[PDB]
C-alpha cells in the first residue's frame, strides 16, 4: 500500500582525531538503497540495492557532490553549535538531519518532514505544513531567524512535495520485485520451562517484510498484557525481519492462551495456540 | 554587500594578477565565472565552504584561496593565452547553485601583449547644428573619443559640474577602426540632447571626459612620448547666443 | 547544456515578450532568470523551484520538469527591460549553468518621428566633423560603412526625464578629403522625409 523515501545523516565531531565522521544513508520503506561514509575508501555515494545500480555515472556523480555538500554543511554547523551552546573543543559532538516524503496506496503526496538535532536532542524541525519552523532552545531560535529570513522553507517544501515523489515513484517501479513485494510471517511456538508449576510460551514470527507487525497474547479471549515480553524488531540480515513475544503462565494450563498476529502479508489476522 | 576590485586591469607575462572578491552577507557559497563576449558565462571555480573550492569548466591556468569566509580572490596566472575577458564574482546563500547568486560588479581583463601598442584616447566635442535647433526645441551635443587602446574607458558628461545622465546615451560597443590584427585602436561615441533654452544660454558649460585605464607606476617605458598613465581626457564647449 | 532561443527577439513598448528555455539534467531542482545589460553585472528577477506559474508584477515564470521547460514572459514591456536575459539552473552543488542568452530588445515609442541628418563642426579647431542621423522611428536601422575609414556607429535610444522625449540617434564620421553628409548614409534604408541641410 503506502510508501516513503528517507535520508538519515549522522555527523560526529572528533577533535584531535581530525576530520569529523560523516555517515549518510538512504531508505525506501525499510530497504536501504544508498549510502556514503567518510572512512570508507570510495568517497562516493554507493548503492546498497541492485535496482539503484541501473542508473549510470550521471546519477552517482551528482548524488555524490550533493552529499559532499551535505557534510560540508555539518562541518560548519558543528562549529556554529559549539559556538552557540558554548562547549569546549575537548568534547566530541553530534548532529543528525533527517528528511523525506510519504505517499498512500494511490502513490500521491501525504506528508514531508525535515528533522534536525544536536547531541541527540531536537534543535529545529520543519513543521507539518512545510511553511513555518519549530525550535527547542533559544539557540535554535537564532537558526530559525536565519532559516526563516533566508526562505529555506520555500526551497525545502518544493523538494518534498516535488522532486522526492517524482523519484520515490521512479525507485518503486525501478526495483518493483523487491519494493512491491510482501513476504509473510512463519509464526510458530516454542514451549520453554521456568519453574516447577510455571511455563513460558514464545510466539515466534520470522522472515517477513515489511517490519510493520503486531503480535499479542489472549488468555481465553481476554487481552493479556503483563507477565509477557516483546523484543524490538530484529533486522534479519536476510532483508526480512523477525519478532517474538513471550508469556509466562501457570503450568499445565497452556492452551487457554492465543497469539493474535496482524500483518499486511497475511489475508487477515492469525490466531495460534500450543499444539 | 558583495564587492570585487579592480573593475579594469591587465598584466604582462612572467607575472600574476589577483582579483579581490569580498562579501559580508555571511554567505557560504562563492563562485567566479568568466563571460567572453561571444559566449555566456563559464564557471572557473566555486566554493561551498571555508577552506574548500571546486573545479569549473576552464579553471586550468587560474588559482584561488578561501582562508576567511569573506574573501575568495581569483589569481589569474602567467598561464592562459586568452585571459582577455570580463570576470564576475558572486556569492549565494545555501548550497552551491541552490540560491540567489548576488553578483559583484565584474572586472574587465586584457592581454597587454606589449607596452608599445598602447594609445590613450583623443577627445573632441562637436557642436550642435542650427538645422536641429530650428526643427526642434532642442540641441544634440556629440563627443568622439578616437584612437585608444586597450578598450578600458568610462565616459561621462559634466555640465557646469553636474555629471548628468538623462539626455545621454553612450554606446554599448566601442568601435574598432581596422578590424583585422590583434593590435588595434578603438573609438567611442556619445550624444547629449538638451533644450535650446539651456544650450543656447551662452555661459552654460558642457564637457565630455574619458577615464582611460593604461600603464601604472608599476610599469617601464623606453619611448619619446607619454606613458599611457591611467588618466582623464576631456574636450568641451560653451553655447552660442542666437 | 541549457539551450536558449538566442535572438535578438524584439518587441514594441507594451507588447508581450515571452522567452523560453530548456535544460539537460533531471537532477536539476533550482531554475532562474537573470537579466544582464551591456558590460554590467547580472541580476535575478525570477527564481522558481516547483512546477506551475509564479508571477511577480510584470514578470511571470513557469516550470515543467517533465518536459524540462522554463519560461519568462514580460507583460507590459518597458525600455528598462532591454538587453540580455540569462536562463540558468542547478541543484546538485555543481555551481550554476547559464544559457547562451537572449537579447530582448524593446522598440521604444517615437510618437513624433521627424527623421533628419544634421552636421556638427568641431569646437577645438574647424572641420573633422560628424553627421548625426537622428529623431527617427524605432523600426529604422543604420548599417555599416561604404568607405574603409568611415566610422558609422549603431543606433542609440536616448531619454530626457522631465520632457519625456525619446530619440534614436546614430553618429558617423571620417577623416576624409570630402566627407559628404548625404552619402554617409548611402549605405542603409533611411526614411524618406529626412530633412537634410
Amino acid at each position: 500500500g503506502s510508501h516513503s523515501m528517507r535520508y538519515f545523516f549522522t555527523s560526529v565531531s572528533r577533535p584531535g582525531r581530525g576530520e569529523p565522521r560523516f555517515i549518510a544513508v538512504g531508505y525506501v520503506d525499510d530497504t536501504q538503497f544508498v549510502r556514503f561514509d567518510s572512512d570508507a575508501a570510495s568517497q562516493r555515494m554507493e548503492p546498497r540495492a541492485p535496482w539503484i545500480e541501473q542508473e549510470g555515472p550521471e546519477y552517482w556523480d551528482g548524488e555524490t557532490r550533493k552529499v559532499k555538500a551535505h557534510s560540508q554543511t555539518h562541518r560548519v554547523d558543528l562549529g556554529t553549535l559549539r559556538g552557540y551552546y558554548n562547549q569546549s573543543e575537548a568534547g566530541s559532538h553530534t548532529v543528525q538531519r533527517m528528511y523525506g516524503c510519504d505517499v498512500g496506496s494511490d502513490w500521491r503526496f501525504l506528508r514531508g518532514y525535515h528533522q534536525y538535532a544536536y547531541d541527540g536532542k531536537d534543535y529545529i524541525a520543519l513543521k507539518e505544513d512545510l511553511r513555518s519552523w519549530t525550535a527547542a532552545d533559544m539557540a535554535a531560535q537564532t537558526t530559525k531567524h536565519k532559516w526563516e529570513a533566508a526562505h529555506v522553507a520555500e526551497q525545502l517544501r518544493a523538494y518534498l512535495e516535488g522532486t522526492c515523489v517524482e523519484w520515490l515513484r521512479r525507485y518503486l517501479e525501478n526495483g518493483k520485485e523487491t519494493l512491491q513485494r510482501t513476504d509473510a510471517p512463519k509464526t510458530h511456538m516454542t514451549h520453554h520451562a521456568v519453574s516447577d508449576h510455571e511455563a513460558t510460551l514464545r510466539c515466534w514470527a520470522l522472515s517477513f517484510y515489511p517490519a510493520e507487525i503486531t503480535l499479542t497474547w489472549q488468555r481465553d479471549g481476554e487481552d493479556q498484557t503483563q507477565d509477557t515480553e516483546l523484543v524490538e524488531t530484529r533486522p534479519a540480515g536476510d532483508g526480512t525481519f523477525q519478532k517474538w513475544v513471550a508469556v509466562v503462565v501457570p503450568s499445565g494450563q497452556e492452551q487457554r492462551y492465543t497469539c493474535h498476529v496482524q500483518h499486511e502479508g497475511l489475508p487477515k489476522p492469525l490466531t495460534l495456540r500450543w499444539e | 554587500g558583495i564587492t570585487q576590485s579592480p573593475k579594469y586591469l591587465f598584466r604582462k607575462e612572467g607575472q600574476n594578477v589577483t582579483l579581490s572578491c569580498e562579501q559580508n552577507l555571511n554567505h557560504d557559497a562563492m563562485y567566479w565565472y568568466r563571460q567572453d563576449p561571444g559566449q555566456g558565462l563559464r564557471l572557473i571555480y566555486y566554493s561551498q565552504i571555508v577552506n574548500d573550492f571546486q573545479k569549473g569548466d576552464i579553471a586550468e591556468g587560474y588559482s584561488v584561496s578561501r582562508e576567511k569566509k569573506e574573501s575568495f580572490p581569483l589569481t589569474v596566472t602567467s598561464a592562459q593565452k586568452n585571459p582577455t575577458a570580463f570576470y564576475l564574482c558572486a556569492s549565494s546563500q545555501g548550497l552551491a547553485g541552490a540560491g540567489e547568486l548576488f553578483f559583484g560588479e565584474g572586472s574587465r581583463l586584457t592581454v597587454l601583449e606589449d607596452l608599445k601598442n598602447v594609445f590613450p584616447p583623443e577627445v573632441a566635442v562637436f557642436e550642435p547644428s542650427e538645422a536641429e535647433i530650428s526643427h526642434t526645441q532642442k540641441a544634440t551635443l556629440v563627443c568622439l573619443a578616437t584612437g585608444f587602446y586597450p578598450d578600458h574607458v568610462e565616459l561621462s558628461w559634466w555640465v557646469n559640474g553636474k555629471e548628468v545622465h538623462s539626455g545621454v546615451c553612450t554606446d554599448p560597443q566601442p568601435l574598432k577602426e581596422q578590424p583585422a590584427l590583434n593590435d588595434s585602436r578603438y573609438c567611442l561615441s556619445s550624444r547629449l540632447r538638451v533644450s535650446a533654452t539651456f544650450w543656447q544660454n551662452p555661459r552654460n558649460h558642457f564637457r565630455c571626459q574619458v577615464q582611460f585605464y593604461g600603464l601604472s607606476e608599476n610599469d617601464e617605458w623606453t619611448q619619446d612620448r607619454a606613458k599611457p598613465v591611467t588618466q582623464i581626457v576631456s574636450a568641451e564647449a560653451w553655447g552660442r547666443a542666437d | 547544456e541549457v539551450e536558449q532561443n538566442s535572438g535578438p527577439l524584439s518587441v514594441p513598448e507594451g507588447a508581450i515578450a515571452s522567452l523560453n528555455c530548456t535544460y539537460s539534467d533531471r537532477g536539476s531542482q533550482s531554475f532562474f532568470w537573470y537579466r544582464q545589460y551591456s558590460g554590467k553585472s547580472p541580476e535575478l528577477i525570477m527564481s522558481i523551484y516547483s512546477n506551475g506559474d509564479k508571477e511577480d508584477g510584470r514578470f511571470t515564470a513557469q516550470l515543467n520538469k517533465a518536459s524540462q521547460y522554463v519560461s519568462l514572459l514580460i507583460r507590459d514591456s518597458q525600455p528598462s527591460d532591454s538587453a540580455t536575459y540569462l536562463c540558468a539552473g542547478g541543484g546538485g552543488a555543481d555551481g550554476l549553468t547559464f544559457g547562451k542568452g537572449t537579447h530582448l530588445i524593446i522598440q521604444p515609442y517615437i510618437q513624433n518621428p521627424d527623421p533628419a541628418v544634421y552636421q556638427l563642426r568641431d569646437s577645438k579647431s574647424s572641420d573633422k566633423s560628424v553627421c548625426l542621423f537622428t529623431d527617427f522611428d524605432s523600426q529604422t536601422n543604420v548599417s555599416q560603412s561604404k568607405d574603409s575609414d568611415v566610422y558609422i556607429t549603431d543606433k542609440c535610444v536616448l531619454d530626457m526625464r522631465s520632457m519625456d522625449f525619446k530619440s534614436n540617434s546614430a553618429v558617423a564620421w571620417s577623416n576624409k578629403s570630402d566627407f559628404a553628409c548625404a552619402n554617409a548614409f548611402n549605405n542603409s534604408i533611411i526614411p524618406e522625409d529626412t530633412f537634410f541641410p
Binding site: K146, V152, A153, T163 | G94 | -
Partner: peptide
C-alpha cells in the same frame, strides 16, 4: 534522490 535546495548552515 538527495536535495540540492533547502539546506543551509545553522
Amino acid at each position: 534522490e538527495l536535495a540540492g535546495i533547502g539546506i543551509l548552515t545553522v
